[PDB]
Amino acid sequence: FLFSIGIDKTKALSLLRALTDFKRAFDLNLRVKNMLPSLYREDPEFYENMRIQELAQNIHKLIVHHNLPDLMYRAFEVLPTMVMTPYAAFQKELHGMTEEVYLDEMVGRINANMILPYPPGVPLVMPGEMITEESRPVLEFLQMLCEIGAHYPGFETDIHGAYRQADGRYTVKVLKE
Amino acid sequence: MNVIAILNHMGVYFKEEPIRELHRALERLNFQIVYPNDRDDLLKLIENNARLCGVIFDWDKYNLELCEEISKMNENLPLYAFANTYSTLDVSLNDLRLQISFFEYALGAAEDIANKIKQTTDEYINTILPPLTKALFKYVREGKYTFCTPGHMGGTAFQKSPVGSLFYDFFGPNTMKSDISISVSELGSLLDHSGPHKEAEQYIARVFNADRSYMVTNGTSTANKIVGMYSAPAGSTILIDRNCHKSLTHLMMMSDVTPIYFRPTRNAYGILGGIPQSEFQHATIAKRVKETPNATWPVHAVITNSTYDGLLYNTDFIKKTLDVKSIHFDSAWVPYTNFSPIYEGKCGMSGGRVEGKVIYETQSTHLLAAFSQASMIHVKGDVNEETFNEAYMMHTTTSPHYGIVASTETAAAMMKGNAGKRLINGSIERAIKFRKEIKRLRTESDGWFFDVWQPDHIDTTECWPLRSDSTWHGFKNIDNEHMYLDPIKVTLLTPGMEKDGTMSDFGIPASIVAKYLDEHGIVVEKTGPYNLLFLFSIGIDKTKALSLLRALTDFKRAFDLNLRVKNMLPSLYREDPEFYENMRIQELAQNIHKLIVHHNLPDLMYRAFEVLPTMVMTPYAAFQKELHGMTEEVYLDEMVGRINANMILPYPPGVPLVMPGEMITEESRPVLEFLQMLCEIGAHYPGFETDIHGAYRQADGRYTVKVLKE
Amino acid sequence: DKTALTVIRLGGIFSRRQQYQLPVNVTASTLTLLLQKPLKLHDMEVVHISFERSALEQWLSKGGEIRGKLNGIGFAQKLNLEVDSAQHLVVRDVSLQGSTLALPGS
């Protein structure tokens, strides 16, 4: 929260009160139907009987189980291998020499686009870089994100540079051979 | 939007009293009632006032006299029809498509009828407004996000500050609140082309007859670079109109490309003519590829269609003839071609795809009405969407202005449909009227007057063809059925040159007419040595036409009295009282004209631009040296035999004279002679200085240019 | 049934919903494709259709019309072919009856 010159007594009270109201409403375990009506309308049947604490538990259990923080930490602690520079790869693109491959097939291939996953919102693979064995945790984090994020409507995976085909598989752009 | 017209006394209480009750009920519901004096006044009110939003009338008294007349003006306008004995559903009505609600005259009905009319008006309003702007207004009304940025918080910080209050006080809350970020996620996304943004693209793409349309918010300067960088690979050769925009030079410096130039023709006046048909034909291009050092077959061509002075190409011929895979019509001057049939076969988008080629128009929306920087890229053919979209996203502003985007969308909303068709039709009609008005005043006055530069008769309403058998245009050996004059672009001629391009003894340089109009706040669209241009837009009304027309007769009157510069040009006088104390307007004109006559300016200017400096290295090659800081200055006099570092852009005539990497030699000595001549002719009168971009006037009065170091 | 044929979606920036063959899985210059439901095409029953892989590529990208020799033999006949929602290739007969295409066994 940023305390700007905008923020007055009315806004501070509304925020402060809104925070105590979240706790109050959470602890009563209100139905998602009642506490999150707009979310409910997205899938009435999916959300009909779910209570706010159950939504929290299920997503948290996923995080706990998939050990998300450790996997995320490790994905960004090593660097993919720079096979060519981003500029060098762009020369190939300038001539239209790109194809798509599936995410599963990307080890040993030269990436054409930046791959920017959310979370944590910073570049993972640059154009011209390649996942190897030295940098396998990169691919493992990516596959893990696709799995953990496939469970709840409204909590989808989000990786820029990967293209979700209408069939639910992911592709990436690579340099042609 | 609250003016309701009522048109009537009927002679019976059973009709008059309910209308009284309804008048009063409607006034209480916040409608302003207006009362046209008669049927014709009502039609003029509607015709001139878009804020009139409903008409109440007796069905029998008026339906056969009004219904069709109103439907011709506006087919959504609410009509509230009151019935009598004979009022009913006659078979004659069955076939008309009308928006009609039938109501009876009754006391106490206004509350419910008003609520229905309100709802029905909102339904009509909701249909016509574009959905993104509609959603934006709804947010401003309902939303409650506090503890938020922007830091100014809907302009709040401006109000506690007299200095900030000056900016806020003028614009106000709504303007301040419409500056929003992606935090308002329900408006979709420009970058994904989703939601109301898609709806806009389809709307535009369908309206403008394109396969695909992008909304660009940094002008055609930016549209060119998005198309350019996608289109012009390194090491390739491009065909480029020597008549090119600077932003394409900036592209050449950034991309390793070799230019071969399409060569326009030019006449003695200096008016550009079209690239002849020969320049597009395979045999001609092949020959230049042979003659150009390191040239290969061109991968990208850029043609300016139309030319400024209204010469349009047979684009059917070009698309069929030019053997280049990628053709970009920079069509900044012809954004309106889809809306008059007179432009069929004469614009980029006309017809269907061109098999085997991508065709572009880039257009400067801001000869229409739109905010500055608004530009469109219209694509006719396929691109690599992922690489094109990456190219777009790389060159997108840091913080897009949410109004600019709506201003381009609302500019279309204004011009849409019939009423926007009738507006442009009206301007064409008045253009021809004014053209004949100048001819009238030419007759009425004794002695010299303005003339119009046009055909002898204009019995036809079209873009008049320029023909080789006609002398009025002054171009030599012109192609026939090639160029056409846009009626709405009116060029006027001032005394000073003959119909030959030869010089008169008596002249009034147009620059002096500009100074006069400038004292009176009237701007001349475009001026040349002896020419002035006026655009008859949808802005221009009877008051402005009279003020201009009268201002022109006042110039003549004041000129012929030979008023003192002191009296006719007081602001100019204040610049040098002593210099101007005794000078009269005719003497100022004589002296400057005599300079032009003596220095033979038109011949020297013509010749400077008819040869080309020698390309020693490419602009890109010279920029590599600049990139390392390897530039020095030399004086203008010392420039023959040196490699120029900067573009040299002189005024007049306002087009590039020397490029980076070019060198003046003996073959191109007239270049230097013109430049030295400009420095001399322009050193005489305060306020009439020389102006050459790329040359630097040192505090001592000498000129320098930047060159490559040895 | 052992096989189908799942055409991989290709993104990027293009006017159509472009499609792509399997990278190297299928690289046969002319590959034959069997059909789960044999159909009556050109007055004969057909169990397999052979395509020039090159011609199948450009049709998966640009669309248009595509020929294929019925039961591997004879002339390359025009075909009512479409990309399925399940990402398969479906051939239709004059009754508009569909059939999924599969790549042959090891």
Question: What do you see in this structure?
Answer:
The structure is cut from a larger assembly and holds two copies of chain A and one copy of chain C (106 residues). Chain A is of the alpha+beta class and 177 residues long. Chain A is 44% helix and 14% strand. In chain C, 9% of the residues lie in helices and 42% in strands. Chain C is built from one helix and nine strands; from the N terminus they run ββββαβββββ. Chains in contact: A-B, A-C, B-C. The A-B interface holds A 1-2, 4-7, 10-12, 14-15, 91, 93-96, 98, 113, 173 and B 146-149, 151-153, 156-157, 233-234, 384, 386-387, 390. The PDB classes it as hydrolase/isomerase. Keywords: hydrolase-isomerase complex, acid-stress, atpase, rava. The entry is titled "Revisited cryo-EM structure of Inducible lysine decarboxylase complexed with LARA domain of RavA ATPase". Chains A, B: lysine decarboxylase, inducible.
Strand order of the largest sheet of chain C: 6-5-4-3-9-8-7
Individual helix count of chain C: 1
Task: Give the number of DSSP strands of chain A.
Answer: 7
Give the neighbour order of strands across the main sheet of chain A.
Answer: 2-7-6
- Topology order of chain C in helix (H) and strand (E) letters: EEEEHEEEEE
Pair of chains with the largest interface and how many residues each contributes:
A-B, 19 and 15 residues
Helix proportion of chain A: 40-55%
- Output the structural class of chain C: mainly beta
What is the overall shape of chain A? elongated
**First-residue to last-residue Cα separation of chain C:** 14 Å
* Main sheet specs of chain A: 3 strands, antiparallel
Radius of gyration of chain A: 21 Å
Can you write the helix and strand succession of chain A as a string?
HHHHHHEHEEEHEEE
How much of the sequence lies in strands of chain C comes to: 35-45%
What share of residues are in beta strands of chain A?
Answer: 5-15%
Assembly status: part of a larger assembly
What can be said about the biggest beta sheet of chain C? Answer: 7 strands, antiparallel
Annotation, overall tally of beta strands of chain C: 9
Give the overall form of chain C.
Answer: globular
- Percent of residues in helices of chain C comes to under 10%
